[PDB]
């Protein structure tokens, strides 16, 4: 049975929370204005809230950048360790001259926040960076168009870009690894021609750049030829080696795939993706007991695309039966009275009544703050609390964070059923697919709005709303109402599917990236759905398709629809 234990942190009146949020935006602008007196005032008797934690984190990034180390250290002490932003941790550790985190951070080859970038340059300037990892990051920044970060890290390592030693060799290599130079019809020939006087590390990385470019363009033969020249695969960035694996996957080179995965950082090897595809490689070469071991490890990763596929390879069907009772209504009422939970619900309720989308976003921040480090039982009670208050996305937020206690009704909530079901049927698309899409797009937040402007439950772009509305005789502004949004989103699902050879995997990619891009990613042979999905060049769409289809399989099992394994829902994507 679920524990009835609920936290009882001190609560504040609804008026005080509203008054503190009244000044949250000004506190944030005060940080940007470097008005330290203003920020300290806002904070000095804030609640123990996400408002205070958010303002304090942003303040500390500004104090760290401004080297106000006395004030920094006083305020860093008021952050809860779980609530420290990464860049704040970086500034703190640089102030302590502690570069233990730098050994892990330096493994990241892309853009880092300023405090984290400086932490690495400081470690570099003291001798306390792994030199192999450090120069790998330099190259990764060079390939990544982060020339200035690359330059500063080369300089911090004692070999600047203008000093005639290693750093000038690496900078010179931009004629191969540059963003536009890697596209050259001659990139490989130049690399081959200057190959003999390059180090083993510089050569492996450079061949990885050329293979990575080819692999993301879906020129699989060209990519595998270039990746096959990489002598030390540890020198590849995480993106490079994953697109090696993706090239080997798309060409069904199972032995090469398994070898590539074994050269991945152990963290990548343990991801559901490479657990599952390693298992598939093993099973396809007949190493059946090694595959069964890996499928079990993938399946244990939880409620995700590859865990389900791995389960299906083990003969395990998705089972959406809860293994835990519903939360008792009394614990749900008590939970709403915990001071941190109550603060989140106050902001949420009042965002509805006041029509304040920013206030609703802070309600989410308070919710994640209030529930951070709840045990599985409190997480499930909180989930029902959120659901009983209409806070649909935070019910999913809390319910999906458990590992052993599974409430599928709360992980895969289905509000608005009689509406979503009818609009799906009206365009003859699977309502389990539509719910899967909504869950990923908006988490059932009717006023959701992405950075690029995608709107509402189904995250329809305003541009797209204008095409849809003219075709079906709507008003394009119906985009901003729940019913109009669902009608437009469901119609666009159906329409994109029709333009993409009626394939549901293509249509999901095309919903997010546009049908023209989804069509460009098809091969000249048919592809198994999950192979098409895992080799989508846009990381946003690649992650999106897998999550939508995984949600769709859970919803279909929940609704009691005729059983469709996820592997068959992925089907076969047709050749062009
Ligand atoms: C339903 C809809 O409007 N889909 C459009 C999609 O929106 C995507 C945009 C995306 C988005 O907002 N990404 C950023 C999300 S976040 O704020 O970073 O979380 N969400 C929407 C639905 O998947 O963007 C692509 C490309 O523009 C369009 O394809 S195109 O017309 O051929 O150009 C497509 O019409
Ligand atoms: Mg989204
Ligand atoms: Mg990308």
Author numbering: 17 to 592
What does the paper say about this structure?
LtgA is responsible for the release of cytotoxic PG monomers from Neisseria pathogenic species. LtgA shares approximately 33% similarity in the C-terminal domain to its soluble periplasmic E. coli counterpart, Slt70, but is predicted to be an outer-membrane lipoprotein that is localized to the septum of N. gonorrhoeae. LtgA is a “heart-shaped” highly alpha-superhelical structure consisting of 37 α-helices. LtgA has three distinct domains: the C-domain, which is the catalytic domain, and the L and U-domains for which the function is unknown.
To evaluate the potential of bulgecin A as a broad-spectrum inhibitor for Lts, we solved the high-resolution crystal structures of the membrane bound Lt (LtgA) from the Neisseria species in complex with bulgecin A. The near atomic resolution structure of the LtgA-bulgecin A complex shows the complete structure of bulgecin A supported by a well-defined solvent model that clearly shows highly conserved residues interacting directly with bulgecin A and those that are engaged via water mediated interactions. Bulgecin A consists of a 4-O-sulfonyl-N-acetylglucosamine moiety that is linked by a β 1-4 glycosidic linkage to a 4-hydroxy-5-(hydroxymethyl)-l-proline that terminates with a taurine (N-linked sulfur) moiety. Bulgecin A is bound in the region of the active site defined as subsite −1, −2, −3, and partially occludes subsite +1. In the active site of LtgA, chitopentaose and bulgecin A have overlapping binding sites. This strongly suggests that bulgecin A could be competitive with the PG glycan strand. In subsite −2, the GlcNAc residue forms direct hydrogen bonds with the side chains of Y532 and T504 and with the main chain of M501 and Y551. In subsite −1, the hydroxyl-methyl of the proline is directly hydrogen bonded to the OE2 of the catalytic residue E481 and the ND2 of N552. The taurine group of the inhibitor is directly hydrogen bonded to S490 and E580. The OS1 and OS2 of the sulphonated portion of the taurine is directly hydrogen bonded to the main chain and side chain of R491. Bulgecin A appears to mimic the oxocarbonium intermediate step in the predicted mechanism of Lts and is most likely competitive with the glycan strand of the PG.
